[PDB]
Structure formats: C-alpha cells, structure tokens
C-alpha cells in the first residue's frame, strides 16, 4: 500500500486548453504536501485549481518559469485516492512527447511524520483530431 | 472505512427494564470520546455500564434531565467494533416511537487528532408481548 | 491484525553453526523495539546481524550471559512482516528441546504510543543428519 503521486497525461492541438490533474493514490492521513510540477515549453499555465481532495484544504501555488510550486496543508488529513489539483494549460507521422515532471516533494502525515511516496510523471503530446482519445476515455 | 457511533434500538412494555448499548464501528485508535445521549420521557435511567471495549478505559457519566453525558478516555486506543457503554433503562393498533439521540460528540485519536464520525440514533417503542422480538433477535 | 514477534526454531548437530531469525508480523509503523532473547546453554552466540527490515535502522545488541539484549530504532517506521535480526549460533530415540525465549519487550510506534504485541518463542533441538529438515523447508 504505497502512497503515489501521479501527474496526468494528455494530448491536444495547438490553441486548445487542456486540464491535467495531479492525483494521489493510497494516501494515509497526509497533512501537508509541497511539490513542484515542471511542464514543457509547448504548454502555458492558465490556472491552477483545487482537486477532489483539497476543496477545503489550505492551498497555495506559484508559477515561476516552467514549474508550478504547490503547497497543500490540511489538518483533517487526506486519505485514499483522488486529485490534489488540476492545471489548466493552453497548448501554444512521427512526433515527440513531453514530460510533466513531479519533483522536490516534501510530504508529511498529520502527526508530522515523513511519508514515503513514489512518483509517476505525466506525458503530453501535441495531436490533431486524434480526439478519438476523448471518445476512448476509460 | 468511516467511524460510526450507533445508539441501539429497543422495545418493551411499561414496568420492564431494558439494556440499550451505544456501539462504535470501525474505530481506529480512538483515545477519547465525549458524547451526549438524549432519551425520551418514557424512559428512566437506572444505570450506565462500561461496554465490551471500555471495561478498562477511564469512564465517566453524568445523568442530567433527559440526557446522559458520557466521557471515555483510553491511552491504549479503541479500535474495531464493539459497545462503548450500555444504558439500563426502566420503561415508565397505531403507536409512536421515540429517539435515542447522539449529539455533542467530541472524539480524538490517541495522537490528539480530531476523528470524523457519523452517528446513528436509536429508536425505542413501548410494546406488549411482542417479545417475539427477543425470539427473533438476529 | 495483532503485531507479533516470533523467535525462529532450528535443529542442528554439535559443532555446526545455525542462523536463527527473530521476525515481526503485522508491524504497524513501529519506531522502537527493545527486547531480550534468551537462549539455551547448548548454544553459543557468534554474531547478531540486522534483518530484512532493519538494514538501515539504528541497531544495537549486547550479549550477557544467556541473553541477547537488542535495541532497534527507526524514524521511518517498520511495518508488515520480516526479520528484525538474525542470530548466528554455534551448537556446542528420545531427546529434549530448548527454548529461545523473547521477553522484556518494550515497543512503541513512531508517534511514541505503546504497541501491544504477542510473542512466540522458538525451539531448538540437537539433531543428526535429520537435515532432511533443510530438504523439507517450506
Ligand atoms: Cl507555494
Ligand atoms: Cl518529506
Ligand atoms: Cl461526563
Ligand atoms: Cl472532535
Ligand atoms: Cl542494547
Ligand atoms: Cl511498551
Ligand atoms: Mg503524534
């Protein structure tokens, strides 16, 4: 039962907005999380929103260069699976993919103990009407 | 896995004593509980006894008006399912039921964190030889 | 889900070395353990080694008379099942068995709470080529 933080993956054409979640899986009474999400040059941050687990948490973020620093604190504890936050991006046969990387993680439970976490990075690709991808979501 | 506190339900004729438990379900290292159990005018409190989980806890109760204030502290932690205490009451086609209500709950785990709990109230009815109810207990 | 500490059992002829683990089962974020393992006169301690769970714990032991005092501290917490340490012994139809006893246990989780544990002692016998026992290990 290992706590894992996961950046979502996505694909979209130039000019469109995408919503990419960062999720947690198997959280066990997490009380604070600080992390950095790095994103590719092809993306531009439009907004950062609380997720399904953090609607009532103390939530901060700061966008600097190609990274979003996010801070979450929640005296109730966060447990189980769900989104920590969503990033709204705008997208500015071969092809190449880009990483949505999670790093600089600092995570503690509500009793102040360090929590071991695994991380999984996201992948983003610029794509055409290949939004059969939306059609195939599952 | 949500911690729930549940007042038992019962039925009996005038003049008889009944034993109504207040139980906990899915407790996770609970260290202290304060609560109020309100009871109907048709009932009169004869005794308040420790339950299956609190035989060795620090246990206090105070009966004032139509409510029983109960305090439990236990440095070992209380976990799982079982009774917190039992109330011995004396009972003083249509018909009407009465609530055994749980409120004013204050509950913390052994590390001093607030515990989220759900509550379920009990129901009491004055009844005749409908103690096929005892016969059907299951 | 009760935390249990278990001394392993073994059999071997005079003159041979044996490796006996002391294991934990269903540990839940244990932060410190002190215990005493007592052993029979027919055994002599050659070494005491960290186990599968304590390779990176702070680990101390002291052999005095027929008992090994072991101290383990680990800020990460120890959870699940595995060995806490291994003792390398040298063995110095009827027959008689000997106890490898666990006692004097003091165990706390990473938040400093006392942990309830059960213990299971080990059994050692001097044996011949009955090391079909190794052949039958399972
Ligand atoms: Cl921040
Ligand atoms: Cl950390
Ligand atoms: Cl009280
Ligand atoms: Cl509370
Ligand atoms: Cl020692
Ligand atoms: Cl102890
Ligand atoms: Mg604590």
Shortest distance between the Cα of C45 and any Cα of chain A, in A, equals 36
Residue C9 near residue C124 (C-beta atoms within 8 A): yes
Pairing of β C43-50 and β C67-91? antiparallel
Which alpha helices (DSSP H) does chain C contain, by range?
132-135
Rounded Cα distance between B109 and B26, Å, is 13
Give the method of determination: X-ray
What number of residues does chain A have? 138
Nearest-ligand number for the alpha carbon of A105: 2
Rounded Cα distance between C51 and C40, Å, is 22
Q: How many CA atoms lie within 13 A of C129 on its CB side?
A: 0
Rounded Cα distance between C53 and C22, Å, is 11
Shortest distance between the Cα of B137 and any Cα of chain C, in A, equals 29
Give the three-class secondary structure for B134.
Answer: helix
Rounded Cα distance between C105 and C38, Å, is 12
- Structural domains in chain B plus CATH codes: 1-138 (2.60.40.680)
Q: What are phi and psi of A13, to 5 degrees?
A: -80, 165
A111 is in an annotated binding site: yes
In chain C, what residues touch A111 (CB-CB under 8 Å)? Answer: 111
Q: What are phi and psi of C102, to 5 degrees?
A: -105, 125
Rounded Cα distance between C68 and C39, Å, is 8
Give the three-class secondary structure for C76.
Answer: strand
Rounded Cα distance between A17 and A26, Å, is 29
Chain Cα centroid distance, residue C70:
10
In chain B, what residues touch A77 (CB-CB under 8 Å)? Answer: 113
What lies within 8 Å, CB to CB, of B65 at 6+ separation is none
Q: How many CB atoms lie within 10 A of CB C34?
A: 15
Rounded Cα distance between A89 and A63, Å, is 12
Pairing of β C3-7 and β C117-120? parallel
Strand partners, A125: A11
CA dihedral C108, C114, C120, C121 (to 10 degrees): 70
**Rama region for A136: left / alpha / beta (φ>0; ψ in -120 to 50; rest):** alpha
Search chain C and give the residue with CA nearest B76.
Answer: C114
**Rama region for C56: left / alpha / beta (φ>0; ψ in -120 to 50; rest):** alpha
Please name the residue that has the structure tokens 């706590």.
Answer: A3
Search chain C and give the residue with CA nearest B29.
Answer: C113
Q: How many CB atoms lie within 10 A of CB B29?
A: 19
Q: What are phi and psi of A127, to 5 degrees?
A: -140, 160
Rounded Cα distance between C10 and C7, Å, is 10
Angle (CA) A58-A63-A64 rounded to 5° is: 135
Interface test with B, best of C110, C111, C112, C115 (most B CBs within 10 A): C111
In chain A, what residues touch C110 (CB-CB under 8 Å)? Answer: 113
Rounded Cα distance between A1 and B113, Å, is 22
* SS percent in chain B: helix, strand, coil, step 5: 5, 65, 30
Rounded Cα distance between B20 and B22, Å, is 7
Ligand 1 centroid to Cα of residue A51, in Å, is: 16
Shortest distance between the Cα of A102 and any Cα of chain B, in A, equals 30
DSSP state of B64: E
Sign of torsion over alpha carbons A115, A35, A80, A112: positive
Give the three-class secondary structure for C133.
Answer: helix
Q: With breaks defined as C to next N over 2.5 Å, after which residues does chain A break?
A: 92
Angstrom resolution of this structure: 2.0
Q: Is C76 close to A114, i.e. CB distance below 8 A?
A: yes
In chain A, what residues touch B114 (CB-CB under 8 Å)? Answer: 75-76
Q: What are phi and psi of A132, to 5 degrees?
A: -65, -15
Search chain A and give the residue with CA nearest C112.
Answer: A111
Rounded Cα distance between A59 and A75, Å, is 12
A6-28 as b/e, with b when 16 or more CB fall inside 10 Å?
A: bbbebbbeeeeebebbbbbbebe
Rounded Cα distance between C90 and C84, Å, is 20
A65-96 as b/e, with b when 16 or more CB fall inside 10 Å?
A: eebbebebbbeebbbeeebbbbbebbbeeeee
E strand intervals along C42-113: 43-50, 58-64, 67-91, 98-109
Rounded Cα distance between A99 and A36, Å, is 13
Residue B41 near residue B117 (C-beta atoms within 8 A): no
Question: DSSP letters of chain A?
Answer: --EEEEE--EEE-TT-EEEEEEEEEEEEEEEEEEEEEE--TTEEEEEEEE-TT-TTSEEEEEEETTEEEEEEEEEEEEEEEEEEEEEEEEE------EEEEEEEEEEEETTS-B--EEEE-EEEEE-SS-THHHHT--
- Pull the structure tokens for residue A42: 């092809």
Shortest distance between the Cα of A75 and any Cα of chain B, in A, equals 8
- Pull the structure tokens for residue B115: 């515990």
């Amino acid at each position: 039962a290992k706590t894992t933080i996961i950046a979502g993956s996505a694909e979209a054409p130039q000019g469109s907005d995408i919503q990419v979640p960062v999720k947690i899986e198997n959280a066990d009474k997490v009380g604070s999380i600080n992390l950095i999400l790095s994103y590719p040059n092809v993306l531009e941050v439009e907004d950062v929103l609380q997720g399904s687990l953090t609607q009532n948490s103390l939530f901060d973020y700061q966008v600097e260069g190609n990274q979003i620093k996010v801070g979450i604190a929640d005296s109730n504890g966060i447990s189980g699976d769900g989104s920590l936050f969503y990033v709204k991006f705008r997208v500015t046969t071969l092809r190449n993919s880009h990483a949505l990387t999670l790093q600089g993680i600092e995570i503690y439970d509500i009793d102040g103990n360090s929590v071991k976490v695994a991380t999984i990075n996201g992948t983003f690709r610029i794509v055409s009407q290949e939004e059969a991808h939306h059609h195939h979501h599952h």
